Write a protein that binds this ligand. Structure first.
Ligand code: HEB
Ligand code: HEB
Ligand code: NA
Ligand code: NA
Ligand code: NA
Ligand code: NA
Lengths: 710, 710
């Protein structure tokens, strides 16, 4: 018996299950990154021999390997499912999930029941990854595989961008839902459904371990109309509308098949549950043949089209021109099969083309026929295949690139020149202007420190690294819907914008550059007022985006309904305010020390929403000192709960109320890690370290979206 | 509802509770460290004004604070308990626990029931920490507080060393035991006791959340003789023998008291369980007065001596010259109280000295009277107090410094010049010698690569960063007990030592420097044989320790009974081999990427214990290439379990056995994180990166104990 906490069950986590999960802020660090510290994937991938890659990947599609042979000699359907599943984890509420990090090769996603046998697909890509090496991330490779499969099977894809950097462990920040079992029906303890089958809000799948919906029907009970409702809901939470959804569904099932020819109970554990002999793979059948015609994956069995190795118009020919009834696959799954199909329409056996097998549709396919709105789009696609192929190709491109962020991050020869609106386009901003002049006019305006700092904070605080949307580039805070969001304090904002817009006209700097410069000036002034002189570093070049290139509705999701950094809460949510602060801070890409210095700094700058004094533990607001920490850590005070999210900080001797504070303020003096950082910053010797760390964190946030640089 | 995994309950941990806990290798990294990257505590603490510190800390002892007032105006007893508990977590089997990192200010230890109200003690030290700042770690401050309390109450302490660096989160690598509740009796599911009340082996306390033993008796049932047995056992696992144990116990209880005057059920949650109003503190009584005479801590109530604010000979006067019986404290705890004590021996009330209260002894104190072996030592101490005070002072110093490592790490003016044997002393080795000459004679000997590398690996692999014992400095591998350990292959070792000892005599380099240089030469040769030229970096100066300064028995604990790095297992243990590898790697201070490249490199060097070919996936053993990874990741093979800790790696086409392998080898191709690293190192473009990373990891291990440098 050794003393190491050597398995994941052994931790502090079990004793206090409600503690802040601060580890989510210290992921993807030096000790897990096996690359050198100056390795830069973007420069390496710019040197990738893409034409040779394209060729190898095309050849892989008809290069069957004996340990997991290709259906009909063609891996295309499998590779498309790979890429679709990689990308189908994305959700709009927080931007988390998607294909942008290569996450499918790690827990939990490598072992979701919906990703069954995608472990075979990934592994089949290894010889390619091995060949191209550090110039081809696993993330880009996984995202690309299905696009090349489409090209090889006859579809004109819209394009492709490289630029996704690999990670080296699971994304600990992603909450995938409340369940403690895989794929439970919504009539379960810990259900993700509330009220009238309303899906809990960040979530974009109908249950734990599925991509979107249950292909056998809602909670496993076929009904195309109820299935349609889930499809509409989930796909909407993955940024897709009805037309995109029907296109994706039909275009997906234009190729490939369902695998369910055997007994599912004979499959070995999923990959994270399997033992070492399985080579990182899972769902292996050691009892009988689990490969080729005997593959079991979803448990449904059949292909949607007569020719599943090729792009064609088989999908709607089959769906719409045959009548369908419910049947059970050999593995016991519900599926739809057509009534009296013709021989010549039967897909052949995957190993022997002289045997005919069956056609199928899932409950989600039948939803495309029975939902009245989908039926119309389906008819359009049956009538107008050129439109079908163009809508699908664009949707497939959107699917696989929706978390890539600004076009500045896109690399390679098949990047579309078009600026799609879901890329939140922003032009390059002028960089030849005198920065000092802009600064002097900001200083010469009569806008306070408070006005300047809050406005810059609010412009940048929308950034989220999950899908790389938001941030200060573009000055979308001056457009709808941002300029009217309650948390942005639209009056104060309009007042500042009037001034700063005039300064930008006068100077030839973008409004975006000026908003940020202005925040810098407020910080510089507050430091100066503590007798400290610095110039904050500054990168010009931000563009101002137009309303035309700003999809008002897609921005709903970036609204700051909470921001602990300005002691802001729009309503009294379920989550604790400090959990909300942790979430926002993780999206911003900030560490726990960074979060800490920002909070202390913003507080003494006087930047709370509504001009509240909660957490403003200073006699000199507007002056940049470590007062917040000095006072938070002083045991001459006691802390008295005083209603919702509010405390009285009281002098122990006089029993008088000296300040007030929220839970967001006080967690920095309560949580044992955070108080340790608070104490560091409250040391007599750490005043300048505080200012310096504050400034660095401020700058990091201001620059977070600046992929146009770097 | 936000999408962030914002509480510690939400993780991958619950789905696969048996996965390797690789996070323990990536702790204490840049994103949690709030200090600058060139901050070096050792240089800062060398500038600390220690005399002024001593004075402030002495003054703190009689500087009562109203929110937790000092007993009789003196915090000494509290401060000694602090420091004792900080240090009493240490255990010898793995070196983990102790006062060396300041761990008491973080979960779980900040919230153990045994650390009740030590949150008050730590907090009382804050004004000091605030004053001295980055030059005084919390770890050093906590370790020092009790030593200064002793000085102030009249004991001549033996000394003190600064040099413990702060950490910023819990020590995730420490397995504290199997229980899921605090302080369950050993008749529980998940018990730490096996067989005839045998304590499971790394563990050094009788239950979860205690320091050593239950002060009310075994599982709460008073019996001094059974208590004695636990005391002997636990203290032995904390490196203390009978004399040290009686001394510590009596010297501890010469001052201070037990607090149990109230109702324990009225205490608020422990700190990690408390809400934000409690300022990071815990066990707060909001129902009645929980301070001063009304303090409740252990639930026992009374002082061991008449004058608990002073060092004196009260302990054995009381214990031995009164007869004792069992009674219940006001909080309901069992305690021993004397029969017919005199008034003048009654400790006074902690607030009002004109009221007399009671004397007490715990079941562990009565063990010092009733255990026949302890009784004799107790009589010696009653008879010879000068000897008592000297043994206690030394033991207290040992207690608080046992995890500090070599004397090279000790800093400050009260460091004892004596070399204590538990410091594993090693002299400075000569550094003026021609390195190249030594190398040429190593090369000119006929020792193989295999011999050279294994011998250097085995010399260094004993290091553990938990208590900083072991490592290649000192060449203790050539002494008892090391030279005869089975895992060290004593014949092969003796053969190499003969040669290298001759080289060291000839050259004036220590045997220790030569063992390491020799390993370097084997690596250099293996690289050369792949047509790669490097000189490995090399730091001379290792000393050769003597047998006189080597406590044979204390080294039992560093024996390599398992080492995955040489595919070594001494017997077929409960833990999986790969969990054992993870444990060893954590003690070595290595990251997961480092662990990975080492394994692949050692395998192809031909360094397995017993000359086994398990994991030796090369046709060119002795040549330093990435073959291990290339072959591990090649799906032309399948992997067949073949008995205990063994697999056949078989060609899929011929169905023939190409190599064999252990679980230690194969986890690098099975675990999803490890295989990701294996794939990186198997890329066509990463051969040199592999050699380079291997070399850096090798060097890190060779230099791990070199605190005499740096
Ligand atoms: C775009 C793309 C896509 C999309 C979106 C989709 C959408 C979908 N999907 Fe899909 N899928 C697909 C594409 C797809 N898909 C493919 C390609 C496949 C095939 C695979 C193979 O062949 O292998 C599938 C397959 C499949 C399957 C089978 C699997 C196996 O193998 O068994 C299923 C169940 C499904 C379902 C589904 C659903 C429910 C949905 C909803 C809506 N799919
Ligand atoms: C060295 C040192 C030391 C040592 C080793 C010890 C050892 C011991 N111990 Fe101790 N303790 C102590 C020192 C000590 N100690 C002190 C100082 C005190 C007091 C605190 C005050 O005064 O506050 C105590 C206290 C105590 C108490 C009470 C707490 C309260 O407050 O309530 C108890 C129960 C105990 C037990 C014990 C035991 C069972 C043991 C075993 C053996 N302790
Ligand atoms: Na994302
Ligand atoms: Na087709
Ligand atoms: Na330790
Ligand atoms: Na005393």
């Amino acid at each position: 018996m050794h003393g190491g906490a050597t398995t994941v069950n052994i931790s502090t986590a079990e004793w206090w299950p409600k503690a802040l999960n601060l580890d989510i802020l210290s992921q993807h660090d030096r000790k897990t990154n096996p690359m050198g510290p100056d390795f830069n994937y973007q420069e390496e991938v710019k040197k990738l021999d893409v034409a040779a890659l394209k060729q190898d990947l095309q050849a892989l599609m008809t290069d069957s390997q004996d340990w997991w042979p290709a259906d009909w000699g063609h891996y295309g359907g499998l590779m498309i499912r790979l890429t679709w599943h990689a990308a189908g984890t994305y959700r709009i509420a927080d931007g988390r999930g998607g294909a942008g990090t290569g996450n499918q090769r790690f827990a939990p996603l490598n072992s979701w029941p919906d990703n069954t046998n995608l472990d075979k697909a990934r592994r089949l890509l290894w010889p390619i990854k091995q060949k191209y090496g550090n110039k081809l991330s696993w993330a880009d490779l996984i995202a690309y595989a299905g696009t090349i499969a489409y090209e090889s099977m006859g579809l004109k894809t819209f394009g492709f961008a490289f630029g996704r950097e690999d990670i080296w462990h699971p994304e600990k920040d992603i909450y995938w839902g409340p369940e403690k079992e895989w794929v439970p029906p919504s009539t379960n303890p810990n259900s993700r459904y509330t009220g009238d089958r309303e899906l809990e809000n960040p979530l974009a799948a109908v249950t734990m371990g599925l991509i979107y919906v249950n292909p056998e029907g809602v909670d496993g009970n076929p009904d195309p109309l109820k299935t349609a409702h889930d499809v509409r809901v989930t796909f909407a939470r993955m940024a897709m509308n009805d037309e995109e959804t029907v296109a994706l569904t039909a275009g997906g099932h234009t190729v490939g098949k369902c695998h369910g020819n055997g007994n599912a109970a004979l499959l070995g554990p999923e990959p994270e549950g399997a033992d070492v002999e399985d080579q990182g793979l899972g769902w292996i059948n050691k009892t009988q043949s689990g490969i080729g015609r005997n593959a079991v994956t979803s448990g449904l069995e059949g292909a949607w089209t007569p020719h599943p190795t090729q792009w064609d118009n088989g999908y709607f020919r089959m769906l719409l021109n045959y009548d369908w009834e419910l049947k059970k696959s050999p593995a016991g799954a519900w599926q739809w099969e057509p009534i009296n199909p013709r021989e010549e329409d039967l897909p052949v056996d995957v190993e022997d083309p002289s045997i005919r097998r069956n056609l199928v549709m899932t409950d989600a396919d039948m939803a495309m026929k029975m939902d009245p709105e989908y039926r119309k789009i389906s008819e359009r696609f049956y009538q107008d295949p050129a439109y079908f192929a163009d809508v699908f190709a664009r949707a497939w491109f959107k699917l696989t690139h929706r978390d890539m962020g600004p076009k500045a991050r896109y690399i390679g020869p098949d990047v579309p020149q078009e600026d799609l609106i879901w890329q939140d386009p922003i032009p390059a901003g002028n960089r030849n202007y005198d920065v000092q002049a802009v600064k002097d006019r900001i200083a010469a305006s009569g806008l306070s420190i408070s006005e300047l700092v809050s406005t810059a904070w609010d412009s940048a605080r929308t950034y989220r690294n999950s899908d790389k949307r938001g941030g200060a580039n573009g000055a979308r805070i001056r457009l709808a819907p941002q300029k009217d969001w309650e948390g942005n304090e639209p009056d104060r904002l309009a007042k500042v914008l009037a001034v700063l817009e005039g300064i930008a006209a006068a100077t030839g700097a973008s409004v975006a550059d000026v908003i940020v410069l202005a925040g810098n000036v407020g910080v510089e002034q507050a430091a100066r007022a503590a007798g400290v002189e610095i110039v904050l570093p500054f990168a010009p070049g931000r563009g101002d985006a137009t309303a035309e290139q700003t999809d008002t509705e897609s921005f709903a999701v970036l609204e700051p309904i909470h921001d602990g950094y300005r002691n802001w809460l729009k309503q009294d949510y379920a989550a604790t305010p400090e959990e909300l602060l942790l979430d926002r801070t993780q999206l911003l890409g900030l560490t726990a020390p960074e979060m800490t210095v920002l909070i202390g700094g913003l507080r003494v700058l006087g930047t709370n929403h509504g001009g509240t004094k909660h957490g403003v533990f200073t006699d000199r607001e507007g002056v940049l000192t470590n007062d917040f920490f000095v006072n938070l850590t002083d045991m001459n005070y006691l802390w008295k709960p005083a209603g919702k999210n509010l405390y009285e900080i009281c002098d122990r001797k006089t029993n008088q109320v000296k300040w007030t504070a929220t839970r967001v303020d006080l967690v920095f003096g309560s949580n044992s890690i955070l108080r340790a950082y608070s104490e560091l910053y409250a040391q007599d010797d750490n005043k300048e370290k505080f200012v310096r760390d504050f400034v660095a964190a401020w700058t990091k946030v201001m620059n977070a979206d600046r992929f146009d640089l770097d």
